[PDB]
Amino acid sequence: QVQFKLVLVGDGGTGKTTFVKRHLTGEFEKKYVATLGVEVHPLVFHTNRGPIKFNVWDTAGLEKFGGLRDGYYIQAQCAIIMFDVTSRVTYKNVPNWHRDLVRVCENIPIVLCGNKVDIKDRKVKAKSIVFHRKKNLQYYDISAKSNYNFEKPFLWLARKLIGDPNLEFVAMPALAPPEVVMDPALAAQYEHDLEVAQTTALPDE
């Protein structure tokens, strides 16, 4: 198969883990559970050129920089630097993360992602985002909540790595299910869950 170790780096409370979870499960973890160390998540995409896999190393933004965490960056092939649109303090740290990345992996596709663009009180604006112009980066506004350009970073990274500018995602190679199987031993238990399922409201905003 094809694997592209991707490194997801950004200040604490920006949405890296939420971004990865929304990509691999579709849920929306609205609780802030700080990621400790690094978490490896495989995302399998299908494109017109076949299947690809991104091993997203979601790193912790609460840690400091330096060599103590260079183990994350070893043999990296693409990076996503994520900053929070509704916080300028998080945007001020993008240069530090870029420096830390390029210290270990010199030339790699790096994508800047401005998260949380669905909130009305927006501090960082499209005019003030000037860092990506000095370097050679691609800047994208994303929102893991409303699903706004939430797959553009992966598409751009795949385009730059595979080498096909006209690459785009195809639907899926989904085939019929194998067969219906049930276990009467636990069947009753399943029914109980339904008895509780109707007693809770959907997370509707």
Next chain:
Amino acid sequence: ASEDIAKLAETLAKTQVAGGQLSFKGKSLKLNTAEDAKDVIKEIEDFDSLEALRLEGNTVGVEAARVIAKALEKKSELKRCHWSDMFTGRLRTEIPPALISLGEGLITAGAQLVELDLSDNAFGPDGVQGFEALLKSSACFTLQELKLNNCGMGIGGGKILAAALTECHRKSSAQGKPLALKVFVAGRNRLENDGATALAEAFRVIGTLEEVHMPQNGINHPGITALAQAFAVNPLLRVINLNDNTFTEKGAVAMAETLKTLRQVEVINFGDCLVRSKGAVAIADAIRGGLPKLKELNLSFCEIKRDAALAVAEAMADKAELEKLDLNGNTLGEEGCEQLQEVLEGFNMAKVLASLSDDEDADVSTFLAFPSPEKLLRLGPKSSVLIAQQTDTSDPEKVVSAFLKVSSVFKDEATVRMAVQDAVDALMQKAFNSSSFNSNTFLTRLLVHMGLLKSEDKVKAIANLYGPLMALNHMVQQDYFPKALAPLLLAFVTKPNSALESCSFARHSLLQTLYKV
């Protein structure tokens, strides 16, 4: 910035030549095993009096944490512990255990922990649970500073920390020495509203706070109102840092309400707080109402408009000890900046405000005619005698002209220089073996043309003498050159002249060659 000098004085006050702080900062030790921490434990044991322990920039595993806690068990005079960023790289199954072990070690030791710093450690609710045991215990009744900057606690962590602080205060009051927190630094933890309200409730119990930092907590107005109400109770507040939150307009009004009743605030950082030019007016009124001892006030990037900026400037000017005002980033017109500067200079300060740098609103004759280095080469070996034959050597003037033309294209390239030198040798060999040819006349004309000597009829001199000097240097070493013209060349080459100092190397080499003979 008075803050920098205050920090410098504080750091100076706690430097000792012996029996003081023990540090491991900037060593990147990966204490991944009990044995791997042998040096650290051995150094900790061999310390007479311990009053501070820094473990910054390291990686403490579970086993190393247990060993270090066992070592700390002995130290009973410990009073501070800066543990900033000592878990870089550890997973979720290894932080709470290490933190609990360290807390138990300190508790059994019987320390006092005048300061407890855990900044830059990725804790979350798990780490908060880990060190809650230490926070509640008797080891933190005397605690005076609790820095948790960038711990990434969150809502649950904030609630747990607030509960722990309340329980610690209750126990301390029961004992007889109530907890008196002075500095609380919990920034960049996303305490958005539940954590912020819980910590405001915790503050309301403790009336001893002096500094409170909560930058970049994603707090909105519903929590900021409660935080302001909690601040109102504390009358000794000195620094109120809430940079990069979202007050909108209700939050700013609530903050002005409390600022009215506080008479010792010295620093007010509200940058990136989206005050929106109405809360700016409210804060201006509050500060005008009386707020001495104010030294700093930051409202940068609050989207303030021109009129509100002028109002706040006018209100602030009345302050006596003002030392810094920031309004950069506000939507002030270009004329607005000039008006603000004029208003400020109307007072004594006139320079207190920070820079407003971001605002919004057959061919031998042909060659001889124009000699060139490449044209000489094209003649090949024929150039050795073609130049000699063509030139009329009866009259020394033509010999000198030919010599100068040949040597003008002289270059250090090996092939060119050899051709030039052999051509010169042939030309002079044919010239010097002529009875009707006076050598002194040739030398005088050569000196005249090079500009080293003057003439009855002023013949215009040449620009560069490098080529002629190199050719002369080569010629002096040949046999046909008379041994009587050496003194004349020596005298007129040692003769000072501007045209000669341009080419110092050729002149020096020629002089050395002349002094050889």
Next chain:
Amino acid sequence: EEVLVVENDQGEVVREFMKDTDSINLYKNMRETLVYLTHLDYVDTERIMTEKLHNQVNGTEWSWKNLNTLCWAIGSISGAMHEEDEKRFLVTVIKDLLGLCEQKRGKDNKAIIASNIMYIVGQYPRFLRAHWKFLKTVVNKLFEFMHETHDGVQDMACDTFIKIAQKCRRHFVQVQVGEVMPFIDEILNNINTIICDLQPQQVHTFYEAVGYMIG
């Protein structure tokens, strides 16, 4: 400075400060040259000193004589910068030196670093006069070094204290902001606890320094 231990005709060893020797002349010439060059361009001199200080902290060039030379060079250019540039430069230098003091282990290394910090502080009286909290902290730290039995620490403390008293004598008698009483009263009230561990000549120096604050 050139300090010589000399015993007079009565067998009393004293520290004499040679004043107009050849070494003092050499130092004065070097100081004058460096001050002229700093006036020509202060940014470059600040950059050179900062680079050398950084080479000291990282350890790639650490040495007692190197640090002493760097601190003498830093102290020689006092008064050659505007007040704000000098303030920023001093904050940077002193912060870095304090950071290096904890890093280095051993009593001798810490003593050398503290002596250098105090020498630098005593050579910039304008910075001390501008800020009162820092001056008071420095004076208290000097009083703490007077109980240090390590060789050369009490002498350094006494020399720095007499320099600070001579240069900033008017900030002790007058009442400062946040102080209910003058600092001279505080020093005089508890003076037997400060000179308890000093040798007699160091006690004489301390009395002279306190006297400069009473005139």
